Design a protein around this ligand. Structure first.
Ligand code: NA7
Ligand code: NA7
Ligand code: ATR
Ligand code: ATR
Ligand code: NA
Ligand code: NA
Ligand code: NA
Ligand code: NA
Lengths: 466, 466, 466, 466
């Protein structure tokens, strides 16, 4: 009847959520449809007024929401603060950008001979809401993935059924209360909690669901997307990354090693755009690896509520097990695994780990490692840096470190990624800008402007003047 | 081994095409991948010079391509000429608009606090080709659906594997020779012919296929889309419609009935945006229905190659049987089926037919009728017009006839369609503008501008200036 | 040494401002240049944070600023409230729209064969601030014209020297204090007060002034613009209107007469887009004129601080004199002048007045009447409605009243105005949208989006990759 | 009465043109107004078909038009061919881009509270032609400045009165016959020839002239602009530049000196964006200056019609005298004037000359030198490079040579220019892209896209739905 939510730090019970049946989730979708009929009939200015009010509340509750993220998600408080502050600015940017993002066209159809009589026509476009959006959240950004999916949906007039990860659902429940305090109709966003195997399918198959937006793994996402699309439903998918960091021989080693450490091990490596594969020109390999090792041993692994904590635990036992499979696989294939930093024995603390002499047939170079394992590969050439970088089924983001920007811009043309970052982190994202990638990183882009267009239908009106 | 192509007018043999095996189609996708590697490395001005040359060749070969359409597709020569002129114009519009449509951004990232240090960044976007496109064409616009899929793909640097309908593949083989004459590398577009059930699956599941664009039936499309998306491939779908024409009591009756007749019966009704359901205000019902019948009986049904033919045959026996079943279903459910006009008995001529007293349980009101059957419904109010109009699983285009545009524009707001046409045909399309709609009418939009965006990936480059 | 500001309602002294010398204004411009060096180096996000803070303060001070407008400008409190609330929303829209409005391009220069080698180039654009803006305000919107000129200038990084009308300078002084409270650097906006004949020229000719934005009369504006442009300075000019209201025989007479009364006599007619010339089809002339007369006699002319006041005085004796010249001119040429409504004898109350049988050689039909004089012209045809409407050197906005929107859209193609309003007021303006006109209405457009582009220089950066 | 056109190469008579009176130019503006009334009523697809035909004729007549440019303008045939190909491409780009550039908006007015009732409004924008354009052409690009002014004007529906430079009017008379051959009405473009001081003022002040677009000198332009704006006419101005080339210590010296030579001396230096001031880092000064001199002495100065000529004459005696005065001024102020290369003594050949040890008081550093005189300055730092670069009243384009793009991009931020070129020539222009700059370099931008917007008026239509 309820599910217990435990801190991955100390396994203490943080709160509980309803264990929903298929039937109760069917009811939440029918209620979200009525919420669509309400919110879609409100003028845009009242909807953006609600979004600006949510923005201000999120700033006022920053510290409370950050502590909650630290407890359920194991995200160090300093990183938890940043996520809540991004969600605040995202809700505001959705308010601010709606007028221009949703703006239609008056087409110059007299430019075209077909159909005949275009000189007597007015043809305009508008962006219409789709209806009910199913939003399936990842565990790792429970407040900011909420904002990415819900802020745009409200701006355009859609309702949302939100299914947070059962690992981190309490954030989503507190976000709903903030939406109601901001003046959002109770029916316009419905939180559903439960096990994926009981409530997953109804959220994807119900005839009243117009669209499914999902952040999660490639395996889980592509199956769900396939089902959604089979019933004529629209899909936005932000799936895995194995983002490479390329360090060229003319790199600033101090900067590149500092940013690599932070990019790989922030939130114990549980980022879609963490620096997951490190590719270093042989000329600087030993200097880079020594600087990297020093910086990883200097991090504080411990309680995420502590101000001095750099790194917390991974989310659960399932993740610990997957990460051990990965370290075993790598030792069994000639990899040099080194444990660099160990946290308390209280929960799901995973040792900050380095793999040297990795090979392309290892789990650490061919799958998404959502944990604090840094594989570092030596290369001889830019060409070999490019091939190893592209050698994954992923294509989210990639970083190049070089004092030679002309050279980095030329390598960037040959990297198959949705973003290339020159002299900065794979972790960089702008919540208003396109985010996403090529290949199996997902489908569409997610960001306030692109999400609003992906969440609306273009509608033309053509008048023939008589 | 070959497949015989027969005219639906007189059943005579027009030509043959290779019955390709799975292994031969595998070869074509491999060669198309080499075509991608070639075409993607040419500068855009060279690709656009190829597209302007195709445009000029299409204009020069117009009468020869029009006659071939008439013979394989049964499309009257007058409508065949219009189709080849549209494809001419589309190839040119892809050349002309590519510079502006593919234009990227220089983002004002210094407007945003996150990530910190945006005042020191340049973030630019470019549109990158996806790679190999699988284009699955419908029978009803063999040349213009070719143009809609191939011209944007060449503009953006994708290669294409083209599977025409086995009913109308001869057009596509003639389009390939025109591409080669225009200077396109032979590897850059590959025509596959054969049975949908022997070569369909390779074209959807081959690892080298990045995207599937398809025009066809809802059931066919959604199954293909489902499979493609399960493998991480992008999809553009233009599936059916059941476009309603709403005729209000204050319409111009002569104009509304003339356009409603052309809208339903053009190409024997085989158009995604045919006027498939006609909703008439009871005040003018008798006058409209009477004007409608006189004009249907004035249409000439006959041989597509005769200059005085208005209406040719339907495409094959399978269609005749689907269309009898819709007629029989209407008779049995209280519908009055009246035949108005009958062409020769020599192939797949289907009588131009009218159904009065239809009901929402009938096939002629709840499915796409891809043939010359016009159901006419009487309504008392605009509210009733809107509820019948919206009652389908489709959402392509709708028309409203009314001398009152103010009322037409308010009704427009409540119609769930990709386009609403005020005082003109459901048939209207602007080949550069979005075409498509809501619900199971498809995924995405198809037009020179929209197809180019859907056929490219956004790629960010972010420089942090040191 | 000081200039006294008097209420046009009761001539009571409301406040005083410095009588500035050429020398002191030279000093204000040199200080605004230093303000440019400061504000242009602040990141955009801090500038938009200042603009959002100004937005909130203007809401908090709405009633105080509205009373001040009522006292110095003679604007009834209810209209004064609306102006302050528009200035609030304008300062916010400038904050909200900057990121997207200022966004540059990444040009697809490989679309072009010239110059040769475009396949090896990156070409981007950015919007740069111009430097120091001279802003010359009208008397009639002292707070909202302030916002139109200052909010965009701050968003883009320009400094502003603001010269309010000597009729209404106290508003501008209170706006500066609100800018400082919001965190704007003291040097970034300088208020100058004085007589045009002492300080006018320095504000237009100083070498440090990059741009002049002016709302005012055509005669004053075109002289200033000529001087600015002679020294290579940019210009935005919002000058006069004589906006026509066209009432067709199928108009809603009740609505058209109500909106005409309000459009002509709001703020005693002192609006650039007041309904200044009324054009009525003869078939409804007597019904319209009787409805108009009734509604004008029912208005309350009196103290603008009173809640029940509809109409206040004109601004000064100079205006009273110009309006008498106009009424004398019209009586002397066969016009039927009728006084409909008289206010107190305390100040510059001008009688609400109607002229019937006007002719095209009268001041009331050929010049801007910035006072409560309504000329009404009878016409026989749409063609005569169009010729009389276009028969002025102005082209700001024009309104058509008709239940036939198809007909009004066709008349709209032949009206030489920057905006045509169908079934609504000439007074309509959207502060984010283009506002302005053809002919001698001015130069450029004024609105948050267009003003930001007019206040920035496009800058290209072209990199040839080596 | 006629004016003799003489070749600046050998002073021989190339042709004659009418010496038009004020009364004859009055007639031409009247006929152009009738041309506006005709061309503005044609649908856009017809006007664009005329522009694509002009493009094809220019390509066919390329060698004949190139030879005429060589003879009247003294422009070497190799550079003349490039000019006629650019104009060919520009006419085509005006045809191709008109549909998207002129596209209006459907504003989301329901995002705004003011005016009340925006939820019931449709507000659309269109681009309307202004009417008659006066195009005043410079001598140095007689055919491409024609294209830049006439092709956008025809695309948007304006008529044009074209006053070519009396030095190079024969090209424009040949362009008119091509327009007529393309199908343009004869009334739609009117060539005026005569003395600037007899017909200049009618072309600027006639009441039927809506806009003046001019390429020429700063002093000429600003006086004309001043007059036009005093009468309420719109203005586009492209006036001088003194583009600096900055060459950093880590530049490719061979490339920087080759491009710097071409940049300064192409067409004897008579380009708005010539490399007019060359700023070299003291570390490479001696090596650059030496490579520079060898390449200048390798250039062939001679007859424009010879295929091996690199550099022809300057345009007339007035130019030779302006250029001697700049030389004499430099000698007297401590400058070392070295002649490097001398063409024939047969017309207006001017020696290719170099000035070392220049000073900021010299004409060769504070004015536009429209001839083959290259001042080279030594600098110690980037800070000094930037201050010299920015020291002019001009702001057209600047170039930076550097293998370090990161440093090139940071310097780019501090240069006050309309475009900065990294590792390429100041000569670069993209005829579709903005061209122009800051300060007294002009008003507005000139390119297919920008010129079309500057040559149209925004017109809003706002419907309130009853
Ligand atoms: N069958 C089914 N039906 C419906 N919903 C389902 C289903 N299976 C899983 N889910 C939910 O999808 C979400 C993502 O889960 P997962 O793929 O494990 O991703 P993570 O949360 O681990 O995040 C990893 C990704 O985030 C960032 C990057 O994209 C990484 O690859 C989460 O809310 C899951 O619920 P559950 O309650 O958690 O099981
Ligand atoms: N020579 C000179 N130099 C500098 N500044 C000068 C000069 N002459 C006037 N002005 C100022 O221009 C502004 C507009 O004045 P005006 O043209 O009388 O317009 P109104 O204020 O009456 O507003 C009418 C217009 O507003 C709306 C519509 O566009 C109407 O036509 C005002 O601040 C004037 O100062 P001053 O102190 O007021 O004399
Ligand atoms: N399983 C499958 N795999 C691939 N293509 C398929 C397919 N089923 C159908 N198609 C193609 O899908 C396209 C559209 O068929 P359709 O029946 O959905 O629509 P239509 O009648 O409008 O052409 C055709 O090219 C069809 O091939 P055939 O016409 O030769 O049958
Ligand atoms: N007062 C005036 N009125 C109109 N046009 C004028 C003018 N003064 C100069 N022009 C024109 O302005 C154009 C540019 O002249 P310019 O000396 O400013 O520049 P350039 O040397 O680059 O051609 C020419 O067409 C010139 O006519 P002439 O070349 O026949 O002299
Ligand atoms: Na990746
Ligand atoms: Na439909
Ligand atoms: Na007007
Ligand atoms: Na310059």
């Amino acid at each position: 009847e309820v599910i217990e939510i435990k801190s991955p730090s100390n396994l203490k019970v943080i709160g509980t959520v309803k264990r929903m049946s298929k039937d109760e989730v069917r009811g939440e979708i029918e209620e979200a449809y009525k919420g669509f009929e309400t919110i879609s009939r409100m003028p845009l200015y009242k909807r953006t007024a609600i979004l600006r009010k949510v923005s201000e509340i999120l700033e006022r509750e920053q510290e409370r929401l950050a502590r909650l993220l630290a407890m359920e998600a194991g995200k160090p408080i300093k990183d938890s603060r940043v996520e809540v502050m991004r969600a605040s600015r995202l809700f505001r940017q959705a308010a601010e950008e709606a007028a221009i993002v949703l703006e239609g066209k008056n087409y110059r159809v007299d430019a075209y001979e077909y159909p005949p009589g275009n000189e007597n026509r007015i043809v305009i476009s508008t962006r219409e809401p789709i209806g009910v959006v199913t939003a399936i959240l990842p565990f790792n950004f429970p407040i900011n993935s909420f904002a990415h999916k819900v802020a745009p949906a409200i701006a355009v007039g859609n309702s949302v059924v939100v299914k947070p990860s059962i690992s981190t659902p309490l954030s989503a429940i507190e976000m709903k209360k903030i939406l109601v305090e901001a003046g959002l109709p109770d029916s316009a966003v419905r939180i559903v909690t439960g096990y994926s195997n009981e409530i997953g399918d109804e959220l994807i198959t119900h005839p009243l669901v117009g669209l499914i937006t999902l952040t999660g793994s490639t395996q889980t996402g592509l199956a769900i997307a396939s089902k959604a699309v089979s019933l004529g439903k629209r899909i936005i998918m932000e799936l895995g990354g194995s983002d490479p960091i390329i360090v060229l021989e003319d790199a600033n080693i101090d900067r590149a090693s500092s940013i690599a450490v932070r990019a790989r091990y922030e939130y114990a490596g549980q980022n879609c755009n963490a620096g997951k594969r490190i590719i270093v020109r042989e000329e600087i390999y030993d200097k880079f690896v020594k600087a990297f090792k020093e910086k990883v041993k200097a991090l504080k692994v411990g309680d995420p509520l502590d101000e001095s904590t750099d790194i917390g635990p991974v989310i659960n036992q399932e993740s610990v097990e997957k990460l051990n499979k990965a370290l075993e696989d790598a030792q069994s294939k000639g990899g040099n695994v080194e444990v660099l930093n160990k946290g308390p024995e209280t929960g799901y603390f995973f040792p900050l780990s380095l793999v040297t002499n990795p090979s392309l047939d290892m789990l650490v170079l061919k799958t998404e490692i959502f944990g604090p394992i840094a594989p570092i590969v030596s290369v001889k050439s830019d060409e070999e840096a490019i091939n190893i970088a592209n050698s994954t089924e992923y294509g989210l983001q990639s970083a190049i470190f070089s004092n030679d920007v002309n050279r980095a811009l030329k390598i960037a043309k040959e990297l198959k990624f949705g973003a290339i970052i020159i002299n900065d982190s794979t972790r960089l994202r702008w919540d208003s800008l396109p985010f996403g990638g090529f290949k199996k990183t997902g489908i569409g882009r997610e960001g306030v402007r692109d999400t609003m267009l992906e969440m609306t239908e273009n509608k033309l009106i053509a008048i023939t003047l008589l």
